[PDB]
Amino acid sequence: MGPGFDFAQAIMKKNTVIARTEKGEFTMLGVYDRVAVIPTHASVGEIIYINDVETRVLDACALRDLTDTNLEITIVKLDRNQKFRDIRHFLPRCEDDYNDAVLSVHTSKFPNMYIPVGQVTNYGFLNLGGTPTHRILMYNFPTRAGQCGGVVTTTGKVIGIHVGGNGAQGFAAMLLHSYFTD
């Protein structure tokens, strides 16, 4: 409808796949080459389904901060025959608050879904499903089951992936440029 949705659409159309694990279907953001991200609670194994195609996982790393605290981001390298567009220059370098964010989902259950969530707070610490988690972003939207892995963007920045909610607020794990240096 406007430049927020325009940027979100551009990311969804070229840089997302549908990932299926034993824990469900997730929106998965491709970042560069064969490297993508997914919430750690997807429990990625040796094999994953990507757009309903059996795919070997070449590497998977559940990220934690230097205090050995969960970040809820898993970085996956896929044995895929095609590279993602490189979107690393849209990733923030530092922890921040944001105005006017969009949460975007693409699954069998919710295809081509875009949600204007508004103001995003650098919340920091969250007890997420019982697990102490750092670098959490919070938005005042009543997010629901099936939105996990959803991409959080502003105009010009890809800032996080949706990892949970409490029925009134939604929570995303930050994406930082330093996660994807090579």
Swiss-Prot record:
Residues 2-180 form the Peptidase C3 domain. It catalyses: Selective cleavage of Gln-|-Gly bond in the poliovirus polyprotein. In other picornavirus reactions Glu may be substituted for Gln, and Ser or Thr for Gly. It is found in: Host cytoplasm. It comes from the Viruses. The active site is at 41 (for protease 3c activity), 72 (for protease 3c activity), 148 (for protease 3c activity). Major viral protease that mediates proteolytic processing of the polyprotein. Cleaves host EIF5B, contributing to host translation shutoff. Also cleaves host PABPC1, contributing to host translation shutoff. Binds and inhibits host IFIH1/MDA5, thereby inhibiting the type-I IFN production and the establishment of the antiviral state. Cleaves host MAP3K7/TAK1, resulting in inhibition of TRAF6-triggered NF-kappa-B induction. Cleaves host TICAM1; this interaction allows the virus to disrupt host TLR3 signaling. Cleaves host IRF7, resulting in inhibition of type-I IFN production. Interacts with host IFIH1/MDA5; this interaction inhibits host IFIH1. This is Protease 3C. It comes from Human enterovirus D68. The lineage of its organism: Viruses, Riboviria, Orthornavirae, Pisuviricota, Pisoniviricetes.
